[PDB]
Design an enzyme around this catalytic site. Structure first.
Site, PDB file in Angstrom:
ATOM      1  N   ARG E 275       0.875  -1.177   0.000  1.00 29.70           N
ATOM      2  CA  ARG E 275       0.000   0.000   0.000  1.00 29.70           C
ATOM      3  C   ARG E 275       0.920   1.237   0.000  1.00 29.70           C
ATOM      4  N   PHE E 280       1.141  10.275   1.766  1.00 36.17           N
ATOM      5  CA  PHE E 280       0.598   9.365   2.762  1.00 36.17           C
ATOM      6  C   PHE E 280       1.625   8.281   3.060  1.00 36.17           C
ATOM      7  N   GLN E 283       3.069   1.212   3.351  1.00 35.91           N
ATOM      8  CA  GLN E 283       2.753   0.189   4.353  1.00 35.91           C
ATOM      9  C   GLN E 283       3.169  -1.195   3.870  1.00 35.91           C
ATOM     10  N   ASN E 322      -3.468  -1.504  11.933  1.00 38.98           N
ATOM     11  CA  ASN E 322      -4.333  -2.282  12.794  1.00 38.98           C
ATOM     12  C   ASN E 322      -5.757  -2.322  12.272  1.00 38.98           C
ATOM     13  N   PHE E 333       3.660   0.846   8.863  1.00 34.70           N
ATOM     14  CA  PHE E 333       3.836   1.837   7.805  1.00 34.70           C
ATOM     15  C   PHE E 333       4.831   2.897   8.170  1.00 34.70           C
ATOM     16  N   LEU E 342      -3.479  10.594  12.550  1.00 35.72           N
ATOM     17  CA  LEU E 342      -3.043   9.239  12.904  1.00 35.72           C
ATOM     18  C   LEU E 342      -2.735   9.089  14.401  1.00 35.72           C
ATOM     19  N   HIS E 346      -2.759   4.889  15.704  1.00 36.95           N
ATOM     20  CA  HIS E 346      -1.718   3.924  15.343  1.00 36.95           C
ATOM     21  C   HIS E 346      -0.529   4.080  16.262  1.00 36.95           C
TER      22      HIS E 346
END
Lengths: 101, 78, 500, 43, 409, 320
Positions: E275, E280, E283, E322, E333, E342, E346
């Site tokens: 990903r 961004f 991951q 998660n 990530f 975030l 996370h």
């Protein structure tokens, strides 16, 4: 009288929801089953801790020894082997037939 | 003693006529300062030591065998 | 303020125990605690008490040990309050002080739970602490029974063939007993309607029912659970056992068959009562006649004595060992039937939320239990008598004696025991001693139990129903003769099987 | 091992747990009737 | 108030407590009358034939005592032993009818009469005669014979005013002897029967208190902790070059332990970054390559470790993917820029400290706009933990345990 | 830091008395040292012999747990309170209940007699205390003001005449004649379950799970903090020689020196044969009038008697 397929399914789900001390509530879900029959069906056959696998060599040896020890007392014997008393009984008879040959 | 005796004697015992019955139908003291030792905050370890599991009720929803048996059984076979 | 009256007693107890537990929660929890969780601690208190009543072991894995110690403390306090109340309300029920029926129901309920806690402990101790009957005592009991049956020339009962000429008569009798239990009642339970249905179905085709019974007796060895209740007779409680209907028909058939073949083959010697031939007041009458017609019975000129002791075999049902019971039933019946009877005693017993396996004594509410008691009682009789005196009492097997009579007068005088009767648990023995035999016994008794202060008069108990001229005179010789006779009979019987 | 069920003892004795220098009193019954007063008046 | 139910009260009543629960019972009579008749031997409790008396005054028959003295040196009445010679013969006179009487007074002996014997001569008189004659008239001759006696000799016979297994087993027959013999010669110990036979506690006390099938327990019988040490450093050897990560192990010990442990066992070898989004976080960490796979060392999803001084501020922050609270797994990530959203969603457990050019090269790989999957594979070939804080801690713990044993062998 | 504290010998257990069937909750000694009286969760009141340790008598009127007993000095009466909301007067000439007091809303937790005036003071779980005429059975006053259950209550001739400690962790010092609070003492953090008054020192100590605090009459001036007994303490008892006893809910006694606050002995006693280790706890203690023996009423249903140890000297057991 005898236990259908769908009745066993209802009984498993109802024990999973209501637990093991409310057999009168569980009997209300079934047709023509009383509370005592529901309980008997659960512990005899439907309980997940009942093990429906093949018998190990160890488990058979304990069976033959304990059946010599306390003869005909299968409720006393049965928790020592960890099978149902009916299971213990029919497997004992199996081995006795097998030793006859 | 004299004062409480007077009080209890009064307790047990325009002109008003004796016949009439009774006529009417039938914040605390200021808060004392809390004089306390400074509180000790709880540690995470001992706060874990007071964690209480939930109650799972059997009712609400919402074997060792002595060796002498062998001896006895053996004797009876003999 | 309202007082605490009889309505409010139990709720007030719970109200106060609740408040006190809450106080200790507050003083126990550390300062600046994130959460109180008081309601959950009180839920664990309730679950602990409920597990106490059901005799189910209570463990909660996470729970802190201050909290668990507090809970075990207060559950033990409530248990003492519960059990003491059970103790004195039973006394009031027995004496007649209560007239309220709900308090009798509550006491019956409390009493049942206490009995099952005790009985479940007794079974556990039986499996852990070994059989109580030793190998020596068991082999002596077994070998004695073999010699008795061998000398009486008893032919053992066979398995009933399917082409047995009497089996529909035995079936018809068994079904009449079972049907008679339901004779009058209206709107019965579901299980009772099931039982009437099975009885009518066995009336319709008997051959099917008989085939089922024979197959049960050959192969069934693991049975359903029985329920237990208590009949409150206000002075004591009687256990009442509930067995499944199918099994009950098979047991009732076996019960009829066993008694018919045992009566035909003369298993039970005539001292074993109740007999079919006499009602119990005729038995009392027979005993008086039997006593009066012993030889020289009332003469006391030389110093002879008569002793008549009536006692009970204490706990005889509970101390039966099912292994030894199997080996002793095999001497009398086809081993298949013996396995069926002994395996049938091994069941789960369940009242309400509590249940345990019976593994020690017999379940007295089986249909054939009466047979077991009489037959097992026969073995106890051979302990109290000898084989020799019992053979004299039963007579030679070609010409057997009848009740309380002898082949000869010399035969009756040969031994001190002259008359013996065993009405189920109760026993009645009549002894005739000369002065030498009495002096012998009293010296052996006073050797074992020396009495310097002569307190033996204190324990002795006699009939306060009669006037003082009619009661027993508690003279020194007679008090020691009675205690010596009783002590000798008590030494006959191993404590593991029964006692007096 | 062999001890029968009515014979068996689960807990140790009182003078086993407290020791010899401690005297244990078990009072199941009392020594006076209710008719006899605790503070008797002079006659 | 009306005393309506007085027998059945809310407590135990006074009479009820007295009669049943340990009140004081009146206990009036105790052994009021228990005297053997004079004519009876004390040992046999039967009429004597040859009377002999002990010096103390107990009278009883010879034929019963003599075997008794041979068997036991003592006398039945008392603990003390008595030598048979000390027994003094007694002679009782008869009437014409045949009853015992006093020879001089002719009074017939009864259980109520007072009976006295003279030691030297052995004769027995009613106490009245002895008194009236000898104690008054100061002669001490016997009445029947002139033998003189001293006052020590006078004795009152009657004054109403005062193991093995084959223990338990007599008569063993042949089959029992033979069976018990073969049993002891053959029987051996059983094997199966023998086999059958923290702030919180093991629950042996509570379970034994609440069920009587468990043996009475009176005394209560009561996990490993790992702490990150210093700084954790891991190199990801990717097909785009090497990325160095600093892990905040002291602050996020469980998350750092999972990561380093996963890396040490080659868990991430060959895994891809599945990903990647423009502006961004990239991951990876899913050995299935699906986007939803992976598993922690423990077995299930482990806790978040949010910390007030760790936020998604700046480029290269290292955090866990998660599926909701306290379900970290394996997936992680790396951020390309600050992303406050975030924070507290996370767990942040490290940051890129080397290979920023590599991180940029990774970001620059085009991704499928529908799936966010990079169009050319970005892959972790290998992972080297070049500083492992957790490993150091384990070694220290083992040494401490050994020391404790020595202190209290 | 402090002066050297006075030396006190240790106390040892010498007699265990076991006759009740529930927790012994209260204990009191007659003014003439012949007998003591214990009340129980058994619901019986038992009168025991102080010399021999024998049970003289049992009295059975109560409906629930007997929570406090006291013996009158100026009349032959025994007063008992209980969780059944009822306070009884027992005449020891007749062994009969002769009068009772009504008006309490909940369980009565303790009671005390005023040493000169004939009033009885009882404290209760409805968060009140009440002053009763002994004769005519009338509430002359209800002392109101606590916000949770009043756990203990004490009386003296000097002002203040009534001290009440409570489960709302405060102490209150009351005017007996007006029935109002004079002083409120909020120094504790957990609930005050035990208060003791010195025989001749004109001070008093109070106990909570925190620590014992020692205070000065009439105004309630704080003196000292006696610390170390980390348990819920149910009773404080003070000797005339300056010994303080703290009996805890987990069964431990701490003996203290009143003068200096020095803890010189810790005692933890075994439980009786049947019981659980969690069953140990002390609900009351009392010295006799001779002060030679110490009586503790316990939660394993026993009464334990402690005696001062005469063979020990300062050299054997030093004062640290």
């Amino acid at each position: 009288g005898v236990w259908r397929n769908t009745e066993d399914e209802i009984l498993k789900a109802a024990v999973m929801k209501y637990g093991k001390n409310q057999w009168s509530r569980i009997a209300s879900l079934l047709h023509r089953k009383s509370a005592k029959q529901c309980k008997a069906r659960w512990y005899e056959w439907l309980d997940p801790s009942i093990k429906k696998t093949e018998w190990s060599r160890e488990e058979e040896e304990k069976l033959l020894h304990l059946a010599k020890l306390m003869p005909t007392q299968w409720r006393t014997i049965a928790p020592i082997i960890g099978r149902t008393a009916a299971q213990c009984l029919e497997h004992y008879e199996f081995l006795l037939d097998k030793a006859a040959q | 003693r004299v004062a409480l005796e007077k009080s209890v004697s009064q307790k047990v015992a325009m002109q008003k006529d004796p016949m009439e019955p009774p006529r009417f139908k039938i914040p605390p003291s200021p808060p004392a300062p809390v004089m306390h030792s400074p509180s000790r905050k709880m540690t995470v370890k001992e706060q874990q030591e007071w964690k209480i599991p939930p109650c799972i009720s059997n009712w609400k929803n919402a074997v060792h065998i002595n060796e002498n048996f062998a001896k006895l059984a053996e004797a009876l076979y003999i | 303020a309202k007082t605490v009256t009889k309505q409010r007693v139990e709720s007030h107890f719970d109200l106060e125990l609740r408040a006190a537990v809450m106080h200790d929660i507050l003083d126990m929890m550390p300062e600046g605690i994130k959460q109180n969780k008081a309601r959950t601690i009180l839920q664990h208190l309730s679950e602990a008490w409920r597990c106490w009543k059901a005799n189910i072991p209570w463990k909660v894995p996470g729970l802190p040990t201050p909290i668990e110690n507090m809970i075990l403390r207060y559950v033990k306090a409530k248990a003492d309050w519960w059990t003491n109340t059970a103790h004195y309300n039973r006394e009031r029920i027995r004496r007649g002080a209560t007239v309220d029926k709900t308090v009798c129901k509550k006491n019956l309920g409390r009493l049942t739970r206490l009995y099952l806690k005790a009985e479940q402990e007794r079974q556990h101790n039986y499996l852990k602490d070994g059989p109580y009957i030793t190998a020596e005592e068991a082999v002596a009991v077994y070998t004695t029974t073999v010699h008795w049956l061998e000398s009486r020339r008893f032919s053992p009962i066979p398995f009933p063939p399917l082409s047995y000429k009497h089996d529909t008569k035995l079936l018809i009798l068994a079904l009449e007993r079972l049907k008679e239990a339901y004779s009058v009642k209206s709107r019965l339970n579901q299980s009772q309607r099931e039982e009437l249905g099975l009885i009518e179905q066995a009336y319709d085709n008997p051959h099917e029912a008989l085939s089922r019974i024979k197959r049960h007796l050959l192969t069934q060895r693991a049975f359903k659970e029985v329920g237990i209740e208590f009949m409150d007779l206000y002075s004591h409680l009687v256990p009442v056992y509930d067995v499944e209907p199918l099994e009950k028909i098979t047991d009732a058939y076996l019960d009829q068959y066993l008694w018919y073949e045992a009566d035909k083959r003369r298993l039970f010697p005539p001292w074993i009562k109740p007999a079919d031939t006499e009602p119990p007041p005729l038995l009392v009458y027979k005993w008086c006649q039997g006593i009066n017609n012993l030889q020289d019975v009332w003469e006391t000129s030389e110093g002879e004595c008569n002793v008549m002791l009536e006692s009970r075999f204490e706990k005889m049902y509970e101390k039966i060992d099912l292994t030894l019971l199997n080996r002793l039933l095999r001497l009398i019946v086809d081993h298949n039937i013996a396995d069926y009877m002994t395996a049938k005693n091994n069941v789960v017993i369940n009242y309400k939320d509590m249940n345990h396996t019976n593994s020690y004594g017999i379940i007295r509410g089986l249909q054939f239990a009466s047979f077991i008691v009489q037959y097992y009682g026969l073995v106890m009789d051979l302990l109290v008598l000898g084989l020799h005196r019992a053979s004299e009492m039963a007579g030679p097997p070609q010409m057997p004696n009848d009740f309380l009579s002898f082949q000869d007068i010399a035969t009756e005088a040969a031994h001190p025991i002259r008359l013996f009767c065993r009405y189920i648990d109760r026993i009645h023995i009549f002894f005739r001693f000369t002065a030498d035999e009495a002096r012998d016994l009293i010296q052996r008794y006073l050797t074992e139990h020396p009495d310097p202060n002569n307190e033996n008069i204190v324990g002795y108990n006699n009939k306060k129903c009669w006037p003082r001229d009619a009661r027993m005179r508690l003279m020194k010789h007679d008090v020691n003769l009675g205690r010596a006779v009783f002590w000798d009979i008590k030494n006959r019987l191993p404590r593991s099987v029964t006692t007096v | 091992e062999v001890v029968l069920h009515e014979d068996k003892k689960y807990y140790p004795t009182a003078e086993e747990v407290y020791g010899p220098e401690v005297e244990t009193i078990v009072q199941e019954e009392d020594t006076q009737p209710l008719t006899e007063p605790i503070i008797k008046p002079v006659k | 108030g009306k005393r309506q139910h007085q027998k059945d009260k809310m407590y135990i009543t006074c009479a009820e407590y007295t009669h049943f629960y340990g009140g004081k019972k009146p206990d009036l009579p105790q052994t009021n009358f228990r005297r053997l008749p004079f004519d009876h031997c004390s040992l046999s409790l039967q009429p004597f034939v040859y009377p002999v008396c002990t010096p103390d005054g107990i009278v009883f028959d010879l034929l019963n005592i003599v075997p008794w003295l041979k068997k036991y040196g003592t006398n039945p009445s008392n603990g003390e032993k008595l030598d048979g010679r000390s027994l003094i013969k007694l002679n009782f006179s008869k009437n014409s009818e045949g009853k015992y009487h006093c020879p001089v007074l002719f009074t017939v002996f009864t259980n109520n009469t007072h009976i006295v014997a003279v030691r030297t001569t052995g004769n027995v008189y009613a106490y009245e005669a002895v008194e009236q004659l000898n104690i008054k008239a100061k002669n001490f001759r016997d009445l029947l014979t002139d033998e003189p006696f001293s006052r020590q000799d006078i004795i009152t016979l009657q004054d109403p005013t005062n193991q093995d297994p084959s223990y338990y087993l007599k008569n063993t027959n042949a089959e029992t002897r033979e069976t018990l013999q073969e049993l002891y010669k053959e029987f051996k110990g059983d094997e199966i029967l023998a086999a059958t036979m923290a702030h919180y506690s093991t629950g042996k006390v509570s379970a034994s208190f609440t069920s009587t099938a468990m043996v009475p327990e009176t005394t209560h019988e009561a996990l490993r902790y790992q702490f990150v040490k210093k700084k954790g450093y891991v190199r990801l050897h990717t097909n785009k070059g090497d990325l160095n990560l600093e892990l905040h192990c002291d602050l996020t010990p469980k998350t750092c332990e999972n990561f380093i442990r996963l890396c040490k066992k080659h868990y991430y070898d060959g895994t891809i970054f599945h990903r990647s989004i423009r502006n961004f976080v990239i991951q990876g960490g899913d050995p299935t390559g699906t986007g939803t796979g992976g598993e922690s060392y423990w077995g299930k999803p482990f806790k978040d470790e949010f910390r007030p001084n760790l936020s998604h501020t700046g480029r290269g922050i290292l955090s866990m993917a998660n599926s909701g609270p306290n379900s970290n797994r394996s997936q992680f990530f790396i951020t390309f820029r600050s992303c406050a959203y975030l924070d507290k969603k996370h767990t942040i457990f490290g940051r890129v400290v080397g290979g920023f050019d590599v991180l940029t090269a990774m970001e620059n790989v085009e991704s499928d706009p529908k799936t966010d999957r990079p169009k050319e594979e970005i892959r972790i070939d290998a992972t080297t933990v070049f500083v492992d804080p957790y490993e150091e801690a384990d070694a220290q713990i083992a040494q401490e345990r050994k020391t404790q044993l020595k202190v209290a062998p | 830091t402090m002066p050297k504290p006075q030396w006190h010998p240790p106390w040892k257990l010498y007699r265990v008395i076991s006759g009740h069937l529930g927790w012994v909750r209260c204990i009191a000694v007659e003014p003439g040292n012949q007998w003591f009286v214990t009340g129980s969760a058994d619901r019986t009141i038992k009168i025991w012999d102080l010399a021999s340790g024998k049970l003289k008598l049992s009295l059975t009127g109560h409906i629930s747990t007997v929570r406090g007993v006291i013996v009158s000095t100026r009349s032959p009466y025994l007063f008992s309170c209980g969780e059944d909301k009822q306070v009884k007067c027992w005449d020891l000439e007749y062994n009969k209940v002769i009068r009772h007091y009504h008006g309490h809303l909940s369980a009565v937790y303790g009671l005390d007699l005023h040493p000169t005036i004939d009033v009885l003071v009882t404290c209760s779980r409805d968060s009140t205390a009440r002053i009763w005429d002994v004769r005519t059975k009338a509430s002359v006053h209800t002392l109101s003001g606590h916000t949770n259950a009043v756990a203990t209550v004490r009386c003296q001739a000097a002002e203040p005449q009534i001290i009440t400690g409570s489960h709302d962790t405060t102490i209150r010092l009351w005017d007996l004649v007006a029935g109002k609070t004079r002083v409120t003492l909020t120094n504790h953090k957990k609930s005050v379950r035990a208060v003791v008054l010195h025989p001749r020192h004109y001070t008093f100590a109070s106990g909570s799970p925190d620590n014992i605090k020692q205070w000065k009459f009439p105004d309630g001036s704080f003196i000292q903090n006696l610390s170390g007994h980390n348990a819920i303490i149910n009773t404080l008892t003070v000797n005339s020689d300056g010994v303080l006893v703290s009996g805890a809910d987990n069964g431990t006694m701490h003996l203290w020196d009143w003068r200096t606050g020095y803890n010189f002995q810790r005692v933890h006693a075994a439980v009786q044969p049947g019981s659980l280790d969690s069953e140990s706890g002390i609900f009351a203690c009392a010295f006799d009038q001779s002060e030679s023996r110490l009586l503790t009423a316990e939660a394993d249903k026993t009464i334990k008697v402690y005696r001062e140890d005469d063979t020990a000297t300062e050299e054997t057991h030093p004062v640290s």
